[PDB]
Design an enzyme around this catalytic site. Structure first.
Site, mmCIF file in Angstrom:
data_model
loop_
_atom_site.group_PDB
_atom_site.id
_atom_site.type_symbol
_atom_site.label_atom_id
_atom_site.label_comp_id
_atom_site.label_asym_id
_atom_site.label_seq_id
_atom_site.Cartn_x
_atom_site.Cartn_y
_atom_site.Cartn_z
ATOM 1 N N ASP A 274 -11.179 0.060 6.589
ATOM 2 C CA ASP A 274 -11.345 0.604 7.932
ATOM 3 C C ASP A 274 -10.990 2.084 7.993
ATOM 4 O OD1 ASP A 274 -8.763 0.035 7.312
ATOM 5 O OD2 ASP A 274 -8.348 -1.199 9.079
ATOM 6 N N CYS B 277 0.826 -1.201 0.000
ATOM 7 C CA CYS B 277 0.000 0.000 0.000
ATOM 8 C C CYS B 277 0.863 1.255 0.000
ATOM 9 C CB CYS B 277 -0.937 0.007 1.208
ATOM 10 S SG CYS B 277 -2.212 -1.276 1.176
ATOM 11 N N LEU C 133 -1.920 -3.639 -2.075
ATOM 12 C CA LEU C 133 -1.397 -4.983 -1.869
ATOM 13 C C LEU C 133 -2.567 -5.950 -1.737
ATOM 14 C CD1 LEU C 133 0.786 -6.893 -1.731
ATOM 15 C CD2 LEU C 133 1.548 -5.953 0.457
#
EC number: 6.3.5.4
Lengths: 504, 511
Positions: free
Chosen positions: A93, A1, A49
């Site tokens: 999240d 990421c 990822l």
């Protein structure tokens, strides 16, 4: 990421995308560019990822003006999602940050997040750009600011050096200070509480608190969707991390067995200790053996990825890089644990014995923790993420480390010629790690690398060296070669490192 | 709205991004890149114009493996969501295609859209890639295919020439034939192979037989329905009142339906012409009769000479009948984008050629030859007429609508017996004039009815001499330019796009 945000760019965007496709090794699966509507100069880019949702430029329906991209993970999204009755449109999240940004601003949304992150937020309603990182330094963020108003934020510095700004010839690509949130006004064109624990500082009822905090940290770090692997160096820290990890995995009913990885030279005590810990715990041990040729041929790419020219974070990052490459090649364990951040938090280094006073001991511990985003976390993060792996530190959390540093100065210091005494005593009765390895505090790789440096750099250029590299001049023939490789890769960006490594 | 797909690549994906931004003028508001998961070699890209909803590379939850990127509008989307009981996660018009692709394959998702569409669909589940275009062709799509499995699709060819492919010296960029869908097999490395390309050419969502006083009613109903259905637009609509009968009726019907639908903003016409030209006077007369907002534009010779290079770069053609009428359209589109806030234009392009609307059509040897020529010239509409009306309009972030080219109206017009379309009393398009005579949509003075190319010729003569024309036969071997104007246009086109002249084959005037 990996994230890449640009603001105020004037030299188009097609010729400025080449920088974005340089941190793509962080996530090799997905890739997205975006332009902020009404702010065509501004642009966003993300690398993911590894199937449908997860694209980081979040733009939810309830908050159309909030564009957030973060390259970390927060372990306290469930608690605030239940407590603050916040509904998430997507499965990521990080959207909780938005659900907190409209609640109390940036201070409340940054100071109530358990985990490691580095987030860029854009709010067109009030025309504000926010940048944030973690307390200690994981999930790196680098920023470049031209006086005209140019903003360039990248997870790694390789995505900002190639950026071109025609307004000024030189742009200063500086690392972001770890615990800090930056709020800037968008023109038309320190925060280091998130919360069983027994009050008091008595020695008997401090081990319970320490064990509870460590177990809670490991259990919180279990939040993932990919496989979990642990780097079994052989020392006390990683041994206990792996033991607790497998204990919670057995408690959490995880199908895949724990996978421990140990990189070492042929016939070394560290590798034998790692094998012993794996045998006692009962995990799947992978014994990576590395020779001189692979370590020498990896120096250039290790320096390129780690973005450093030191002698301590480039002499131990070679093995971590090799084991990360091996893991990516012959293993599906994406999420990886590490014991890094545990031998300065509780004064585990060799030089902490020669301590003038405990006060200076914890002052140096705090100083080392503040400068952890350049020495230890850099090695464990850049090398790990260069192979599509995600790092987790079960020792460097916000609560356990704070409690350890809030303890009396007398307990932290070694007392019987053995470092990490409190940590050893706390888990001694739990039988998590064999007593042969838990106790007994503490390979020819530096010498061969030094002999290679002697054959690479000469002797006359050593004396007349401290004018080719004025700031932070190298001393030995090894650091000079590291600095030479760094300068060849990144030219003139030697201001990232201020001091090399100062043991007392 | 500009689409861009790069199925198959070996030369990274960041050095191959400038071509994507070369067509960013279609929508200058947003721009998204995307990489298909598991197929990191293939990449998408969109440039959207005019909030949160949009971002045309749709990936619906119910169809995680379908990735669609489309340019255009499907007008019969409110008649398919109800009938086929299909939901819509996003407010995008094109999502319906995805649903139809899961219902009746590709044939049933292509011959059911009563609009304009150029779309790229990727299905990683069955490893297939689908292309498409309109039946008539008012949406631009260009394909570049390399044998090693390279399929690069861009709305305009300016986004494919820059693309670099190693291991292949030349990359052939050719226009996509409208009315075709190209099924393509996706090899498990990003490469693309071709399996199918077949023509496809929806009434299930007051049509008597053929007879006079009844066919006119059918034409009235079809034209009114076409304009009413084309009214679907979230932004302002402004007609291009050139002055001709087709645009006059289009604007009159547009204003009538806008008043019927209670639209707050008033319809505004838009005319460009030389000083005191009769066409401008006729446009002003029509605007006064229908009660609209006329913004006439007077364009000078110097502006046209300066904009010749830009219009050749944008229109992507080197004709003598296309870049000679596209200069005015380009200038008026620039005026509309600058001093006005109308982004959707209902031009009357694609009308005369449908209803025997040229000077030479008077000297037709036979009605059958006349109708065959009408069909042939209307099939080749993607190079001569629609190209000028679309590329120039979209070069300034404006959208095009051609209500005269709708499938139902045009199909009914061409299904008429040949003796009714043919000129009857020495006029052009008799039946269209009679079909609206009693409606009073357009005044009888204009319904019942050039110092521009001289400056171009003199400027070309001053620019290009006979020395170049003495060797232009071998300088440009394919489709050699005869007139000096064509020579200069071809020179500018070759300077802009080098060695890519297979796009155009013929020019005009089949006597």
């Amino acid at each position: 990421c990996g994230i890449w945000a640009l603001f105020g760019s004037d030299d188009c965007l097609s010729v400025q995308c080449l920088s974005a496709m340089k941190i793509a090794h962080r996530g090799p699966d997905a890739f997205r560019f975006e332009n902020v509507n009404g702010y065509t100069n501004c642009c966003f880019g993300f690398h993911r990822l590894a199937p449908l949702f997860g694209m980081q430029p979040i733009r939810v329906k309830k908050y159309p003006y909030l564009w957030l991209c973060y390259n970390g993970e927060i372990y306290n999204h469930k608690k605030m999602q239940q407590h603050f009755e916040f509904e998430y449109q997507t499965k990521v999240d990080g959207e909780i940050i938005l659900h907190l940004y409209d609640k109390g601003g940036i201070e409340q949304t940054i100071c109530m997040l358990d985990g490691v992150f580095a987030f860029v937020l854009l709010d067109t309603a009030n025309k504000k750009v926010f940048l944030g990182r973690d307390t200690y330094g994981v999930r790196p963020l680098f920023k470049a600011m031209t006086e005209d108003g140019f903003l360039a934020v990248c997870s790694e510095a390789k995505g900002l050096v190639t950026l071109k700004h025609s307004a000024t010839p030189f742009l200063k690509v500086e690392p972001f200070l770890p615990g800090h949130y930056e709020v800037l006004d968008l023109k038309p064109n320190k925060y280091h509480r998130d919360v069983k624990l027994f009050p008091g500082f008595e020695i008997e009822t401090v081990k319970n608190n320490l064990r509870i905090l460590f177990n809670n940290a490991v259990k919180k770090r279990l939040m993932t969707d990919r496989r979990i692997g642990c780097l079994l160096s052989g020392g006390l820290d990683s041994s206990l991390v792996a033991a607790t990890l497998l204990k919670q995995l057995k408690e959490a009913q995880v199908q895949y067995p724990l996978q421990t990885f140990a990189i070492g030279m042929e016939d070394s005590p560290d590798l034998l200790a790692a094998r012993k810990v794996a045998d006692h715990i009962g995990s799947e041990h992978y014994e990576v053996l590395f020779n001189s040729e692979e370590g020498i041929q990896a120096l250039d790419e290790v320096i390129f990825s780690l973005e450093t020219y030191d002698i301590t974070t480039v002499r131990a990052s070679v093995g971590m890089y090799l084991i990360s490459k091996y893991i990516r090649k012959n293993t599906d364990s994406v999420v990886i644990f590490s014991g890094e951040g545990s031998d300065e938090l509780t004064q585990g280094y060799i030089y902490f014995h020669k301590a003038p006073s405990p006060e200076k001991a914890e002052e140096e511990s705090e100083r080392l923790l503040r400068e952890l985003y350049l020495f230890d976390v850099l090695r464990a993060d850049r090398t790990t993420a260069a192979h599509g792996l995600e790092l987790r530190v079960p020792f460097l959390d916000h609560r356990f480390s704070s409690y350890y540093l809030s303890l009396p100065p007398e307990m932290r210091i070694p007392k019987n010629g053995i470092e990490k005494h409190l940590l050893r005593e706390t888990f001694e009765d739990s039988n998590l790690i064999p007593k042969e390895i838990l106790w007994r505090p503490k390979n020819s790789w530096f010498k061969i690398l030094q002999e290679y440096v002697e054959h690479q750099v000469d002797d006359a250029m050593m004396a007349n060296a401290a004018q080719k590299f004025p700031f932070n001049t190298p001393k030995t023939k090894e650091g000079y070669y590291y600095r030479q490789v760094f300068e060849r890769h990144y030219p003139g960006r030697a201001d990232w490192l201020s001091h090399y490594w100062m043991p007392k």
